[PDB]
Amino acid sequence: GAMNSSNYAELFNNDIKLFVDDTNVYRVTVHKTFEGNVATKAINGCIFTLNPKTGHLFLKIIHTSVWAGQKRLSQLAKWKTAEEVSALVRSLPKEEQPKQIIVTRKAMLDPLEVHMLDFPNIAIRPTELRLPFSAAMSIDKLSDVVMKATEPQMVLFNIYDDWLDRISSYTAFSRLTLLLRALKTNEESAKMILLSDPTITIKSYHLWPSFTDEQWITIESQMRDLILTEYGRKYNV
Amino acid sequence: MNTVPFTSAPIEVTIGIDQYSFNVKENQPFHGIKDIPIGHVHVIHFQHADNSSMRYGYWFDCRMGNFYIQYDPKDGLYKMMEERDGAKFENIVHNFKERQMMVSYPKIDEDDTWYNLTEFVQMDKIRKIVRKDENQFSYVDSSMTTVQENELSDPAHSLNYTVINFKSREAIRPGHEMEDFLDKSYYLNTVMLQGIFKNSSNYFGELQFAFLNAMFFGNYGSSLQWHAMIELICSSATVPKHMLDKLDEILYYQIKTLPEQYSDILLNERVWNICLYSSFQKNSLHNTEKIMENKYPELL
């Protein structure tokens, strides 16, 4: 069924599963027309599909052309997301195909379910957790590749950089969600924290700086502090 | 006018015929129902005074034979049986009448209700759902399951309704995933109307059969089937105008006939809010909308 705090360690067993986040698929700006009405201009979006065990990210870029001459665009983004996740699954070797797929938003259930009809033994699951994958686009290199594209384009990353070489999935995923939680809550601050020290650099093949172990601890501590600060400010606690 | 005699009434029971029904007391001398309109299907059903669980009955059509009712004490229920001896049957029928131990099918001539409920119900179609082809009449009860339910146990006792699944390959043409699923016209018109049911009138017959089975037996699979058949039409952007208008009439009479205190299990909140207010056919069930609002404003 649904994924929550009870069945949380299931993400890290050896059953291949993916997360699908669609929040960044249909992205717009809002502006005023010459006649003063309101009008939306769309920009390149991205499907965020992620293997929480291995860090493998399947970042499907969604070009603005896909909207050209289309109605009920927000509804359509769901079906497109589902189309493109199903095409990803079909392109993978049977043994690489996932046993399950977790949509971070319950609206995607029907579209994906329809689209995955040919894989009846692939379970589509909602989640009760409140994952922060909408802030995927606060990661500089992901936003850059999205915003540069001239055509539908698939790009592969490992969103854990090389961390697994020294830590576990569970921990990797926790770091990942924490860093994204902060970037969501106050991006300017979260980003200050990650880049303050010009001497800790981001490898060309990596998304995050090459912190030593000790430095990761500092950083998690600073990220945690930021997130508590922002909540007190939100509710006057 | 046809008659259905009863051998005997050993046990206290509430007997129903079509939408009528009568209390009969243990070893009351009851011997049958007379003046039954030749022309439609009928259904005679039972609820024992001792087990309000398991209501049960038999669908039939007098033009197919002479049927009577006999209590079987091994199985403990009223069984429908057919007499093959033409002469021997009229003899029991005329004696009980002249002893007047029979109740008259009590039809007001203004009332078109049973026909409106059974307009499209044919026996031949019924016996392809309650397969038991050594008998010309069909037995249904509260606890019988359908074929879709068996999928998600004993197949002899199956209700072989037509299987409708909105999230199936059948219903969803590859490439038209979003289209076919927001707009079930394909599924309705080509798969189900032209392919499986052949015409509108069979479709309706099954829909109406489903309803009556749920109403008279609280057959929970039958309720589900009826709402699925409604749902498919109401989720179809392109429907023949004759079917819409007939559907508005068919439901109207269904809502009208339902016991008022059962509106909670037999009416699926989602499907009806979709038909009447959300779906393509919101504007097209004027009569069903209106009865629904004035009778069951709560559920909406």
Swiss-Prot record, chain A:
- Places the protein is found: Nucleus
Instruction: Please tell me, according to the UniProt entry, what happens when changing residue 105 to K.
Output: Severely impaired growth. Reduced growth at 30 degrees Celsius. Strongly reduced growth at 16 degrees Celsius
Which domain of life does the protein's organism represent? Answer: Eukaryota
Give positions of region: RNase H homology domain: 7-237
Changing residue 22 to A has the effect of: Reduced growth at 30 degrees Celsius. Strongly reduced growth at 16 degrees Celsius. Strongly reduced growth at 35 degrees Celsius
Q: How the protein is affected by changing residue 21 to A?
A: Alters protein folding. Severely impaired growth. Strongly reduced growth at 35 degrees Celsius
Q: What is known of its domains?
A: The MPN (JAB/Mov34) domain has structural similarity with deubiquitinating enzymes, but lacks the residues that would bind the catalytic metal ion. Contains a region with structural similarity to reverse transcriptase, presenting the classical thumb, fingers and palm architecture, but lacks enzyme activity, since the essential metal-binding residues are not conserved.
Q: How does it assemble?
A: Component of the U4/U6-U5 tri-snRNP complex composed of the U4, U6 and U5 snRNAs and at least PRP3, PRP4, PRP6, PRP8, PRP18, PRP31, PRP38, SNU13, SNU23, SNU66, SNU114, SPP381, SMB1, SMD1, SMD2, SMD3, SMX2, SMX3, LSM2, LSM3, LSM4, LSM5, LSM6, LSM7, LSM8, BRR2 and DIB1.
Name the job this protein performs. Answer: Functions as a scaffold that mediates the ordered assembly of spliceosomal proteins and snRNAs. Required for association of BRR2 with the spliceosomal U5 snRNP, and the subsequent assembly of the U4/U6-U5 tri-snRNP complex. Functions as a scaffold that positions spliceosomal U2, U5 and U6 snRNAs at splice sites on pre-mRNA substrates, so that splicing can occur. Interacts with both the 5' and the 3' splice site, as well as the branch region. Has a role in branch site-3' splice site selection. Associates with the branch site-3' splice 3'-exon region. Also has a role in cell cycle.
Report further notes: Present with 468 molecules/cell in log phase SD medium.
- How is this protein named in the record? Pre-mRNA-splicing factor 8
Tell me which species this is from. Answer: Saccharomyces cerevisiae (strain ATCC 204508 / S288c)
Gene expressing this chain: PRP8
From Swiss-Prot, chain B:
Q: Name one GO biological process term.
A: spliceosomal tri-snRNP complex assembly
UniProtKB keywords: Cytoplasm, mRNA processing, mRNA splicing, Nucleus, Phosphoprotein
Q: Quote the Gene3D superfamilies the UniProt record gives.
A: 2.60.34.20, Aar2, C-terminal domain-like
Q: Which domain of life is it from?
A: Eukaryota
Q: What would be one Gene Ontology cellular-component term for the protein?
A: U5 snRNP
List residues, modification Phosphoserine. Answer: 236
Q: How is it modified after translation?
A: Phosphorylated on serine and tyrosine residues.
Region (Leucine-zipper), start-end ranges: 244-265
The yes or no answer to whether the keyword Transferase is present is no
- The question of whether Chloroplast is a record keyword is answered with no
- Please give the residue positions where the record annotates the modification Phosphothreonine: 257
Q: Where in the cell is it found?
A: Cytoplasm; Nucleus
Question: What the protein does?
Answer: Component of the U5 snRNP complex that is required for spliceosome assembly and for pre-mRNA splicing. Involved in splicing pre-mRNA of the A1 cistron and other genes that are important for cell growth.
Family as reported in the entry's similarity comment: Belongs to the AAR2 family.
Q: What else is known?
A: Present with 7330 molecules/cell in log phase SD medium.
Q: What quaternary structure, including any partners, is listed in this protein's UniProt entry? A: Heterodimer. Interacts with PRP8 (via RNase H homology domain and MPN domain), competing with BRR2 for the same binding site. Component of a U5 snRNP complex that contains at least the U5 snRNA, PRP8, SNU114, AAR2, SMB1, SMD1, SMD2, SMD3, SME1, SMX2 and SMX3, but is not a component of the U4/U6-U5 tri-snRNP complex.
Q: What is the protein name given in its UniProt record? A: A1 cistron-splicing factor AAR2
**What species was this sequence derived from?**
Saccharomyces cerevisiae (strain ATCC 204508 / S288c) (Baker's yeast)
The record's gene field reads AAR2
